[PDB]
Amino acid sequence: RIARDLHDTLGQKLSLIGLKSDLARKLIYKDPEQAARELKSVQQTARTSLNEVRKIVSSMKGIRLKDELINIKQILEAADIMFIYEEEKWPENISLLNENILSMCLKEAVTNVVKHSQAKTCRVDIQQLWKEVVITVSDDGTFKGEHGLLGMRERLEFANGSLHIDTENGTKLTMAIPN
Amino acid sequence: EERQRIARDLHDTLGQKLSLIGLKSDLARKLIYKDPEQAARELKSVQQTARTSLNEVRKIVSSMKLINIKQILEAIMFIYEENENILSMCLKEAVTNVVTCRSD
Ligand SMILES: Nc1ncnc2c1ncn2[C@@H]1O[C@H](COP(=O)(O)OP(=O)(O)CP(=O)(O)O)[C@@H](O)[C@H]1O
Ligand SMILES: [Mg+2]
Numbered sequence: 168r169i170a171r172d173l174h175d176t177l178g179q180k181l182s183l184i185g186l187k188s189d190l191a192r193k194l195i196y197k198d199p200e201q202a203a204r205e206l207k208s209v210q211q212t213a214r215t216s217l218n219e220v221r222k223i224v225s226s227m228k229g230i231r232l233k234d235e236l237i238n239i240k241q242i243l244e245a246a247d248i249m250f251i252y253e254e255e256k257w258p259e260n261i262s263l264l265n266e267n268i269l270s271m272c273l274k275e276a277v278t279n280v281v282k283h284s285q286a287k288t289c290r291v292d293i294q295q296l297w298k299e300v301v302i303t304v305s306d307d308g309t310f311k312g313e314h315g316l317l318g319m320r321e322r323l324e325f326a327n328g329s330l331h332i333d334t335e336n337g338t339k340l341t342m343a344i345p346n
Numbered sequence: 347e348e349r350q351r352i353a354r355d356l357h358d359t360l361g362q363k364l365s366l367i368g369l370k371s372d373l374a375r376k377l378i379y380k381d382p383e384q385a386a387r388e389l390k391s392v393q394q395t396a397r398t399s400l401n402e403v404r405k406i407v408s409s410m411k412l413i414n415i416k417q418i419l420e421a422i423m424f425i426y427e428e429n430e431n432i433l434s435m436c437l438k439e440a441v442t443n444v445v446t447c448r449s450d
């Protein structure tokens with residue numbers, strides 16, 4: 168996973184930084200022009216490696232719940248669906264990891280609204296109850312069915328939480344996760 | 347805090363090594379003609395830092411992914427007589443540092 172990306176994209180860059188380096192050395196007196204070229208190559212590869220790092224560190228830190236909310240506001244307004252959120256007391260101390268899980272889920276949910284729902288409006292509820300945080304997303308558009316969905320289910324279930332789908336007044340997704 | 351530790355270490359050591367590869371590379375370039383033996387020295391320095399980054403990636407990977415302490419002690423006599431993450435990592439470092447040990 169994280170290991171294959173690290174080892175591969177980053178590994179291959181770093182390996183290459185060494186090889187090109189060593190080549191440019193071999194050419195300092197025989198072909199200084201070609202040493203020079205080789206090293207701009209080195210610097211370009213090193214810069215992009217820094218990008219790779221950025222990305223990896225970003226996945227592993229996890230998206231924050233708050234930031235995911237902000238994001239879904241943006242997304243729905245861009246799809247012209249109306250964003251309703253009656254703000255209430257914030258989740259006590261949810262896991263840093265569980266909070267990512269919720270953010271990822273909420274993401275794919277809201278996405279499915281802008282994609283299939285034909286919805287006018289979309290409600291988002293975040294509430295802390297018992298020793299578990301539950302987020303609800305409903306949308307007033309007809310359900311189109313009966314990847315992403317089974318995905319939420321599983322992420323959330325290895326988590327020890329659950330997912331429900333209700334297609335009576337649209338599609339109301341309910342994710343719950345322990346802390 | 348474990349994915350948080352890992353993101354942090356990756357960004358730390360690899361952040362720095364890659365900037366250094368940046369700057370040194372750029373220097374050797376500046377020196378190809380005005381000072382080639384120095385350009386060469388600089389570049390050996392770049393290769394070495396690429397090596398050590400490869401090592402660092404290698405090790406972090408190893409943290410996500412006892413016989414070993416025994417033969418590492420051999421190569422200095424040791425005694426032993428018989429959460430997983432924290433305990434194995436911490437004992438590994440413990441004996442790396444001691445390199446008689448039942449704890450030495
Ligand atoms: N809010 C919604 N309104 C209406 N239908 C929905 C819906 N959310 C999901 N669906 C239905 O579920 C189907 C598949 O959902 P899922 O998210 O698993 O796949 P998808 O079609 O979004 C592509 P991906 O697998 O890349 O997400 C859709 O084709 C659609 O019929
Ligand atoms: Mg989908």
Ligand SMILES: [Mg+2]
Binds near residue numbers: 442443
């Ligand atoms: Mg030590």
